Amino acid sequence: GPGSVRVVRGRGLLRAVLDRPERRNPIDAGLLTSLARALDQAESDQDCRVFVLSSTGEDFCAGTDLSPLPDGAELPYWTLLERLTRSPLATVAVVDGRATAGGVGLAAACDLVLAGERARFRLTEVLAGLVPAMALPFVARRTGEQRAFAATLRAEEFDAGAAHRVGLADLAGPRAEDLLPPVLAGLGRTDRSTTAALKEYRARLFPRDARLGHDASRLLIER
Amino acid sequence: GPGSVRVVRGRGLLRAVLDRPERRNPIDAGLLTSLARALDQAESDQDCRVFVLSSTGEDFCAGTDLLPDGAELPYWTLLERLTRSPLATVAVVDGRATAGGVGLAAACDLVLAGERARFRLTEVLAGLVPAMALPFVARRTGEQRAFAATLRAEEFDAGAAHRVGLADLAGPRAEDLLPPVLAGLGRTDRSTTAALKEYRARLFPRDARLGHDASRLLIERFAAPGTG
Amino acid sequence: GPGSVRVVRGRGLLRAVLDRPERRNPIDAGLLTSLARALDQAESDQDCRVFVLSSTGEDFCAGTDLPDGAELPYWTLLERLTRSPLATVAVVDGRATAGGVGLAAACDLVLAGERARFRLTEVLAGLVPAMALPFVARRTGEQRAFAATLRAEEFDAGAAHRVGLADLAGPRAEDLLPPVLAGLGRTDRSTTAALKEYRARLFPRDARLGHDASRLLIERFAAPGTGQLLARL
Ligand SMILES: [Cl-]
Ligand SMILES: [Cl-]
Ligand SMILES: [Cl-]
């Protein structure tokens, strides 16, 4: 039926829209492949400055679609989250629905998270006997270690205001999509060279160790 | 009475109660040994999932009434155990936590704070650096608020503690916040909680020399002339 | 002509006043040298316990108008404000722009009055504020420091207090100082210096960061795009 992701080109921007609302926009190999290709297309256009991740229906992203790992290897979900943090593009998540489990990590790995009245964020992994090890670093770099780990242990649900007050969302309002035009106007005041250097410097100051992607991937598989 | 800790066994849980309300529940070698033994008892029971630290009277814990290379003081070893235990560790704070009493709560996975909860590091007023407690406070509040609160001997009520991350939950009474927290913890298991706490240590580690360095800094400032 | 810094001595304290209000208190080689000399003077006096950085007019500090391992003077000064045995206190009752934000953020305590504004404007000129960012992020956390940089976000006193950029906020930063000094009088220079040393033990900056941060600012000023964005401003 419909492809996992619909791509829309704009002025200096590429939008990837999660486009399976009837399945609650879950993460399958197809979604991860399509989002990577979309970021590749955006990065391959030297005039592109911004990558916008948005969605459809009641669910922004519901996490793994349930319908051995070599020493040193990492799973594709980890790789995609690291790319959203390391892209020369400004990455912007427009959250106007429920982000559940791996869907939280997907939003959190973006440079800016915009949350509307329908936004909800909840890591449900401990209820399935899992540690959300791949998502956690991307949440903890926003919320700090205590709120990320306590929210995991409690499967805490954040609405838009709660997400904004803990740093999981950068901006909050009635509708995330209506927050986007002023964000794009502001990003148009800088350039891709500058945004790239800024995100590379964030990795210099707040690095993730070389073994973490493997260790996080292995912990998710081991359980 | 003289017994620093009373142990209450429960359904999938062990409670350690600081049980010297008239002495204001001070930290002495006896309290630290009794808490370590209670955590040993809880961990040895394979059906135990939760360790609850609670107290009595106006004071949750008033702290202490005022080294070989590589060695760590028992206070350091106990706080590190509360962060690394396979049990979910829960502090129920319905009174004043002062000096080392702050670190004892802060080292727990979840801090519940009631209307009478207060948190204050008073060490700089005695010429001390609270070096052993600070890593467990900063892992909750972040570095700036931990260090600024230490320099200013800042007092936090339950609301202020909740806003800065020192408390995870706040309400009229910390003990009344416990039943829903335990119901929530029942949806996971000890295997998962242990793995989550081990991953927190993987992602946000304390280096292997820190317990010794922190222990030394407290001992060396008891000795400083300005301190007495 | 005009001295960038006016020094005022008090009991237990030395106050460095940025004293060029009609120039908006800009960062130049002279300001950085003068502040380093003031800090030397303050540290040399064994009865000095507090170094107070305060300013004049509408701007606290408007900001600015490599051999291997070398650090720029701005980096050296910010690091000194974090390593000084003195309690370092920024009194912000005006606009802190660009490098001005890092100068406040490197103090142990930031006091913000109603007129305080903090804004990293560097990305609008094609720059990364690499030397100030570690001193901002050690207060706000990485996400708010980097997002505020990407958006050139302006913080008022309330916003700065909520995110940890300011430790204290009130009507006037200058009037939050006497209660802060009364509190600091309950401890001593020995204890303050040991606490700041322990912050460096718990939350260190690696040995190459100052050089890497200094180099990134020099690289960005040389980017072809930088002159065109300055032209835009
Ligand atoms: Cl995960
Ligand atoms: Cl201590
Ligand atoms: Cl800078």
Side-chain angles (χ1 to χ4, degrees), chain A residues 1-10 12-223, chain B residues 1-10 12-228, chain C residues 1-10 12-233:
Chain A
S4 169
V5 175
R6 173 165 40 90
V7 168
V8 195
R9 303 184 51 250
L13 77 96
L14 184 140
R15 185 194 294 256
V17 192
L18 277 73
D19 208 25
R20 298 194 165 151
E22 274 329 290
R23 299 175 64 79
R24 309 201 187 170
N25 290 123
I27 305 175
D28 64 346
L31 179 65
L32 289 180
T33 302
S34 295
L35 283 184
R37 289 192 338 249
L39 193 53
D40 290 345
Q41 180 182 343
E43 287 175 348
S44 296
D45 181 351
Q46 293 306 304
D47 290 328
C48 194
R49 291 177 290 102
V50 184
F51 181 80
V52 179
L53 178 57
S54 73
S55 190
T56 50
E58 296 183 32
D59 294 85
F60 172 81
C61 182
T64 301
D65 181 353
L66 296 167
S67 84
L69 184 71
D71 186 1
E74 65 191 35
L75 289 169
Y77 175 82
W78 173 271
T79 306
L80 180 62
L81 294 202
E82 279 209 317
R83 286 186 73 184
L84 293 164
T85 75
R86 298 300 298 272
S87 180
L89 307 182
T91 54
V92 182
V94 177
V95 188
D96 274 316
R98 298 179 290 250
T100 309
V104 176
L106 187 61
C110 294
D111 294 323
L112 296 175
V113 173
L114 278 52
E117 70 187 15
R118 297 188 63 95
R120 298 293 186 276
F121 304 83
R122 183 188 192 207
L123 292 164
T124 53
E125 280 80 352
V126 301
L127 319 172
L130 304 176
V131 176
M134 294 184 295
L136 263 160
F138 304 93
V139 175
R141 75 184 191 126
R142 289 177 158 283
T143 65
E145 73 171 274
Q146 179 61 30
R147 191 48 167 280
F149 278 85
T152 298
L153 179 62
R154 298 178 63 228
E156 177 174 12
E157 186 196 48
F158 303 88
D159 65 5
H164 187 40
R165 295 190 297 271
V166 304
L168 185 58
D170 296 285
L171 295 174
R175 194 156 150 96
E177 182 63 38
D178 290 339
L179 296 169
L180 179 64
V183 164
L184 295 176
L187 287 175
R189 297 174 305 182
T190 193
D191 65 11
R192 174 164 166 171
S193 181
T194 307
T195 297
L198 178 65
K199 294 181 56 166
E200 185 75 358
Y201 189 60
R202 188 176 175 167
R204 172 67 180 84
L205 190 50
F206 292 96
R208 280 177 298 268
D209 76 63
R211 292 284 291 177
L212 183 63
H214 173 65
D215 287 340
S217 297
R218 189 181 70 257
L219 179 55
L220 293 174
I221 292 171
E222 275 164 348
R223 326 184 57 86
Chain B
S4 50
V5 178
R6 180 159 47 77
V7 170
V8 183
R9 84 181 52 248
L13 81 99
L14 183 137
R15 185 195 291 262
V17 182
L18 305 188
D19 201 34
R20 298 178 299 170
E22 303 311 307
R23 285 182 40 67
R24 305 192 181 281
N25 290 125
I27 301 179
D28 54 18
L31 180 146
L32 294 175
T33 305
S34 292
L35 281 181
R37 287 187 184 165
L39 189 56
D40 286 346
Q41 176 175 356
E43 288 172 346
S44 74
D45 182 355
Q46 293 304 305
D47 292 321
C48 192
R49 286 177 294 99
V50 185
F51 182 83
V52 177
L53 181 59
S54 71
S55 193
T56 52
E58 285 177 15
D59 296 86
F60 171 78
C61 176
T64 299
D65 74 335
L66 307 179
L67 178 75
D69 187 63
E72 303 172 334
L73 287 167
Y75 178 83
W76 175 270
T77 305
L78 178 65
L79 298 201
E80 196 159 29
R81 289 191 61 198
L82 291 168
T83 74
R84 297 306 298 272
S85 179
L87 307 176
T89 58
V90 184
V92 180
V93 182
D94 275 316
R96 294 184 287 264
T98 307
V102 176
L104 183 55
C108 291
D109 296 319
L110 295 172
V111 172
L112 276 45
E115 184 168 9
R116 295 213 201 79
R118 301 288 188 277
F119 305 82
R120 191 190 186 198
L121 296 167
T122 53
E123 279 80 350
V124 300
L125 305 178
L128 304 178
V129 172
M132 295 184 294
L134 264 168
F136 303 92
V137 175
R139 87 178 210 291
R140 289 180 158 280
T141 64
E143 74 170 273
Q144 179 59 34
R145 188 52 161 275
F147 275 89
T150 298
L151 180 63
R152 300 178 59 236
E154 181 175 7
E155 185 166 339
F156 301 84
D157 65 14
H162 185 43
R163 287 191 301 274
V164 302
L166 186 58
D168 298 283
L169 290 182
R173 181 159 170 79
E175 186 63 43
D176 290 340
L177 301 176
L178 186 63
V181 166
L182 294 176
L185 290 171
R187 305 168 300 176
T188 198
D189 61 24
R190 177 163 162 169
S191 183
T192 310
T193 297
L196 178 66
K197 293 177 64 163
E198 183 85 355
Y199 189 55
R200 189 178 177 169
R202 168 71 181 83
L203 189 53
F204 291 98
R206 285 176 303 265
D207 70 78
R209 291 295 298 193
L210 183 61
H212 174 59
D213 289 342
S215 294
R216 188 172 67 249
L217 180 54
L218 191 76
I219 290 159
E220 287 308 299
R221 297 198 65 79
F222 275 101
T227 294
Chain C
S4 57
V5 174
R6 168 157 45 84
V7 168
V8 189
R9 300 182 52 234
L13 76 95
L14 188 137
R15 180 199 290 275
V17 182
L18 302 193
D19 204 30
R20 296 178 301 175
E22 287 202 306
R23 291 205 54 205
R24 305 195 163 183
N25 290 122
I27 297 175
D28 52 21
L31 179 143
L32 296 175
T33 298
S34 290
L35 286 178
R37 179 181 334 116
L39 187 60
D40 287 348
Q41 181 178 346
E43 290 170 350
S44 292
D45 182 348
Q46 301 302 287
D47 289 307
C48 192
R49 293 175 291 100
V50 186
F51 180 82
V52 178
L53 178 58
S54 72
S55 190
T56 50
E58 281 196 342
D59 297 86
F60 172 81
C61 181
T64 300
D65 180 61
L66 183 69
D68 193 64
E71 299 169 333
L72 287 171
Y74 175 86
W75 176 270
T76 303
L77 182 60
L78 298 201
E79 186 182 287
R80 285 191 62 191
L81 291 169
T82 75
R83 296 309 298 271
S84 181
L86 306 179
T88 54
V89 178
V91 175
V92 185
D93 279 312
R95 297 183 291 256
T97 311
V101 178
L103 183 61
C107 293
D108 299 314
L109 296 173
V110 172
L111 279 45
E114 291 191 338
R115 298 191 183 194
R117 302 291 188 274
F118 301 84
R119 189 186 188 203
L120 295 169
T121 54
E122 277 83 350
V123 300
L124 303 172
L127 307 178
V128 174
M131 293 184 293
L133 270 163
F135 304 94
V136 173
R138 76 182 186 132
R139 293 182 156 275
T140 65
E142 57 167 292
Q143 176 62 30
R144 191 47 161 286
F146 277 85
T149 298
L150 179 61
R151 296 177 64 224
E153 179 177 3
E154 185 166 340
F155 299 86
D156 66 9
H161 186 43
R162 286 189 304 270
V163 305
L165 184 52
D167 296 285
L168 298 168
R172 202 167 75 110
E174 182 62 38
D175 301 322
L176 297 168
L177 184 64
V180 165
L181 296 175
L184 292 174
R186 302 170 304 174
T187 191
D188 57 31
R189 174 161 161 172
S190 169
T191 308
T192 302
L195 180 66
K196 292 178 66 161
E197 182 80 357
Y198 190 58
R199 189 176 180 170
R201 172 64 179 87
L202 283 196
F203 294 96
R205 288 173 299 268
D206 68 65
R208 292 290 290 200
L209 183 59
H211 171 67
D212 289 339
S214 297
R215 190 183 65 252
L216 183 50
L217 191 56
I218 294 164
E219 289 165 350
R220 292 310 303 159
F221 262 112
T226 289
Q228 316 158 4
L229 282 153
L230 280 167
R232 294 179 45 180
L233 290 179

